[PDB]
RNA sequence: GCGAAUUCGCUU
RNA sequence: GCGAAUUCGCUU
């Protein structure tokens, strides 16, 4: 049975105006990075009007466009694609009901020409940070090395708490004027290094390291449109989450880039709309 | 988000 | 179970 491949076209048509940028984030046009998502199906998707999703960066216009049709795929590749599809909703979004068609998969350019990113899928399956927390072996003789490039489009997790279910953060800023020896926000500890040593008994091998600003990755399920004591408490906690300053040495980098993660959170809205 | 305490509304 | 109010704990 032949396949149809669609691209989930995303463009940021109305960036979030300053008066609405409460969390004071950078805005990230999806169109700025080539890797995106597509849909692979056995039957054609009826033409559907362009529609908005309202993301953190502003209003994004979604277009579902045909990329390829009439081709075949081997059982091996379909299995790989299926696994990644399942990975997206169970491990990235942590969602039991994808649509609040058949396989979502990553596309990338080969040259400005979108096709199935098999390499990326394989990289995910080989990653030691694929599911939870990868092992490390930092010592004085083999210390942690900070490479800025690895933090530019990164999602990170703390390696030292919550291991059944790690909190994933976007790296929002790299604070090059700070180190683990900078003064700690709470007065019960003098430094970041002391905090982590006293609380978790963690030793640092690198004391020249920049520190990181973060932005939680959590997103509401329905983004198709742009209160309570409970919502207050939740917003307060999110504010504190976002005030956290993390030590790169103490975090692991997730194999899914930040730019793709931002597109992932739109998927349920889009699949819901398609099934309507 | 994960938990806790106190108080109040909806049923006959 | 469906809701609401007030207060407190967990992150740096």
Curated annotation (Swiss-Prot):
Domain of life: Eukaryota
Effect in UniProt of substituting residue 249 to A: 5-fold decrease in activity
Cellular localization per UniProt: Cytoplasm; Cytoplasm, Perinuclear region
Occurrences of domain PAZ (ranges): 119-255
Known outcome of mutating residue 195 to A: 10-fold decrease in activity
Residues with Phosphoserine modification: 229
The protein's assembly and partners: Component of the RISC loading complex (RLC), or micro-RNA (miRNA) loading complex (miRLC), which is composed of DICER1, AGO2 and TARBP2; DICER1 and TARBP2 are required to process precursor miRNAs (pre-miRNAs) to mature miRNAs and then load them onto AGO2. Note that the trimeric RLC/miRLC is also referred to as RISC. Interacts with DHX9, AGO1, PIWIL1 and PRKRA. Associates with the 60S ribosome. Interacts with BCDIN3D. Interacts with AGO2, TARBP2, EIF6, MOV10 and RPL7A (60S ribosome subunit); they form a large RNA-induced silencing complex (RISC). (Microbial infection) Interacts with ebolavirus transcriptional activator VP30; this interaction prevents TARBP2/TRBP binding to DICER1 and thus allows the virus to counteract host RNA silencing.
Disease involvement: Pleuropulmonary blastoma: A rare pediatric intrathoracic neoplasm. The tumor arises from the lung, pleura, or both, and appears to be purely mesenchymal in phenotype. It lacks malignant epithelial elements, a feature that distinguishes it from the classic adult-type pulmonary blastoma. It arises during fetal lung development and is often part of an inherited cancer syndrome. The tumor contain both epithelial and mesenchymal cells. Early in tumorigenesis, cysts form in lung airspaces, and these cysts are lined with benign-appearing epithelium.
Role, per record: Double-stranded RNA (dsRNA) endoribonuclease playing a central role in short dsRNA-mediated post-transcriptional gene silencing. Cleaves naturally occurring long dsRNAs and short hairpin pre-microRNAs (miRNA) into fragments of twenty-one to twenty-three nucleotides with 3' overhang of two nucleotides, producing respectively short interfering RNAs (siRNA) and mature microRNAs. SiRNAs and miRNAs serve as guide to direct the RNA-induced silencing complex (RISC) to complementary RNAs to degrade them or prevent their translation.
Family: Belongs to the helicase family. Dicer subfamily.
Protein name, as recorded: Endoribonuclease Dicer
Organism the protein comes from: Homo sapiens (Human)
Lineage: Eukaryota, Metazoa, Chordata, Craniata, Vertebrata
Gene responsible for this protein: DICER1
């Amino acid at each position: 049975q032949p396949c149809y491949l669609y691209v989930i076209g995303m463009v940021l048509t109305t960036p979030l105006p300053d008066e609405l940028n409460f969390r004071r984030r950078k805005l990230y046009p999806p169109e700025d990075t080539t890797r995106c998502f597509g849909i692979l199906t056995a039957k054609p998707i009826p033409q559907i009007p362009h529609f908005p999703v309202y993301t953190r960066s502003g209003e994004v216009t979604i277009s579902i466009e045909l990329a390829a049709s009439g081709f075949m795929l081997s059982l091996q590749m379909l299995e790989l694609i299926t696994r990644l599809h399942q990975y997206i909703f169970s491990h990235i979004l942590r969602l039991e009901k994808p649509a609040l068609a058949y396989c979502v998969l990553p596309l990338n350019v080969v040259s400005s020409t979108l096709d199935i990113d098999f390499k990326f899928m394989e990289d995910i399956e080989k990653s030691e940070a694929r599911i939870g927390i990868p092992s490390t072996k930092y010592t004085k003789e083999t210390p942690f090395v900070f490479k800025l490039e690895d933090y530019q489009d990164a999602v990170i997790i703390p390696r030292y708490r919550n291991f059944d279910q790690p909190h994933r953060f976007y790296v929002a800023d790299v604070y090059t004027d700070l180190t683990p020896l900078s003064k700690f926000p709470s007065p019960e500890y003098e430094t970041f290094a002391e905090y982590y040593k006293t609380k978790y008994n963690l030793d640092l091998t690198n004391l020249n390291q920049p520190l990181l600003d973060v932005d939680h990755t959590s997103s509401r399920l329905n983004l198709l449109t742009p209160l309570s004591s409970a919502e207050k408490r939740k917003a307060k906690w999110e504010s504190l989450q976002n005030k956290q300053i993390l030590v790169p040495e103490l975090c692991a980098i997730h194999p899914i880039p930040a730019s793709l993660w931002r597109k992932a959170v739109c998927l349920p809205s889009i699949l819901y709309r398609l099934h309507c």
